[PDB]
Design a protein around this ligand. Structure first.
Ligand code: VO2
Ligand code: GLC
Length: 448
């Protein structure tokens, strides 16, 4: 109990999640009206991907994904069958992100990207061609059009200087001309939430949400255009990147924020920002555990009171440990080897506590997230017909796909909050690559 008292702190009651779900619905409406959109913590951003597409182009497209831990490049082909486009990644390649790119200027970052883009085109001899290029850019962007928009600010721990405030698609081109090595027609810039929804629509036409629970946490949904005041028009629907990770930045979570959350936030690349994301994201979960463990040893409840050298350095506890720990079959060998690598010698009950700590952190994350989705799905259900409103949600992100139980805890809780709704989850088999391509395919029936 002395331990379970400290852990029970991470608990959230059914009534707590409802309160969170209602507060999200609120910030959502606030960021959609013109009069509040500006200081709304949930920015609710028009993506310019719209309800009824005009028509699509076929052929190969070049897709970029940045915003992950890693930058990726892939070529995807696009065709047409009975029900809309089919897409399929045909070639691909990842490129680690250097420290000299993340510290330097936006200009340096993008040249590095320009390079990897040429390196890629080498290995597959294609440097001589000019294809439509879809860009999945996993950051808050204020779009002027499907291929126009500026970076509002970095999240997840990117710093590249003098990037905020500028057009991203521009900079991409800027860097390609700083090469002459090749040409590319940049036709669409989309959020990963959005890339993922689109990749999934073609599978299930009812797929109208894209949720990412990976290093960050964000969601996007199809909204009524008359509700999108920042964009002119009333017919049809535009996809809206909620950027809900910023939920709580106006202080809507304060009654739920634990000391471990205050500490993570303080030391983060962005104090006071992405507060909701820091309860859930992968950038942050392993760190929450680490802080919890360190609290537990400072109360002589763990590791005999003595914390490791690494256990004491920030970020030393990787989110992917939290998974491994929660995967241990019950024999404790999975948990032991982990703490072993971190310079500790866990007793048996040491291991059993660390399991409990993870479960406490990740399960909070699961539920906190479900409130958010639930509040989206409720909002959609509100401006829309009804009986049992079926709806599909396209999902992606390591935390969701790999953490052994987050998925189960998350589905259960979402459903508890959404009666009358029959929610279906699909995991995007390469949703970035093909979501972008699919969106470029239709953007490019205008720019080609
Ligand atoms: C594959 C796909 C790709 N693009 C779509 N729409 C797009 N609109 C613009 C301005 C660019 S691409 C699109 O619209 C259909 C749709 C998607 C999600 C919800 C409702 C309709 C589907
Ligand atoms: O990586 C998933 C999410 O991470 C962060 O919240 C980004 O701001 C958002 O654009 C993205 O969708």
């Amino acid at each position: 109990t002395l331990v379970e008292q400290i852990l029970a702190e991470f608990q959230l009651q059914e009534e707590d999640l409802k309160k969170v779900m209602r507060r999200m619905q609120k910030e959502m409406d606030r960021g959609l009206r013109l009069e509040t959109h500006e200081e709304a913590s949930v920015k609710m951003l028009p993506t310019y991907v719209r309800s009824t597409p005009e028509g699509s182009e076929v052929g190969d497209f070049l897709s970029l994904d940045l915003g992950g831990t890693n930058f990726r490049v892939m070529l995807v082909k696009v065709g047409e069958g009975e029900e809309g486009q089919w897409s399929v990644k045909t070639k691909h390649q990842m490129y680690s992100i250097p420290e000299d790119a993340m510290t330097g200027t936006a200009e340096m970052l993008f040249d590095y990207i320009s390079e990897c883009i040429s390196d890629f085109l080498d290995k597959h001899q294609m440097k001589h061609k000019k294809l439509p290029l879809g860009f999945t850019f996993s950051f808050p962007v204020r779009h002027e059009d499907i291929d126009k928009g500026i970076l509002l600010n970095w999240t997840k721990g990117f710093k590249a200087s003098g990037a905020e405030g500028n057009n991203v698609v521009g900079l991409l081109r800027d860097a390609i001309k700083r090469r002459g090595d090749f040409e590319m027609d940049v036709v669409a810039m989309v959020n990963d939430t959005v890339a993922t929804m689109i990749s999934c629509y073609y599978e299930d036409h009812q797929c109208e949400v894209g949720m990412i629970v990976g290093t960050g946490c964000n969601a996007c949904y199809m909204e009524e255009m008359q509700n999108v005041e920042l964009v002119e028009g009333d017919e049809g629907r535009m996809c809206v990147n909620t950027e809900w990770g910023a939920f709580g930045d106006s202080g809507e979570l304060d009654e739920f924020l634990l000391e471990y959350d205050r500490l993570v936030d303080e030391s983060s690349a962005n104090p006071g920002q992405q507060l909701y994301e820091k309860l859930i994201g992968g950038k942050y979960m392993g760190e929450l555990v680490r802080l919890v463990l360190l609290r537990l040893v400072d109360e002589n409840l763990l590791f005999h009171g003595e914390a490791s050298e690494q256990l004491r350095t920030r970020g030393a506890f990787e989110t992917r440990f939290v998974s491994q720990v929660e995967s241990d079959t019950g024999d404790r060998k999975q948990i032991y080897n982990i703490l072993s690598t971190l310079g500790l010698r866990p007793s048996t009950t040491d291991c059993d506590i660390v399991r409990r700590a993870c479960e406490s952190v990740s399960t909070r994350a699961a539920h906190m997230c479900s409130a958010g989705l639930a509040g989206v799905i409720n909002r959609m259900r509100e401006s829309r017909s009804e009986d049992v409103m079926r709806i599909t949600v396209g999902v992606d992100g390591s935390v969701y796909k790999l953490h052994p139980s987050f998925k189960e805890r998350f589905h259960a809780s979402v459903r508890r909050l959404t009666p009358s709704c029959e929610i279906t989850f699909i995991e995007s088999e390469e949703g970035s690559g093909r979501g972008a391509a699919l969106v470029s395919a239709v953007a490019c029936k205008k720019a080609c």
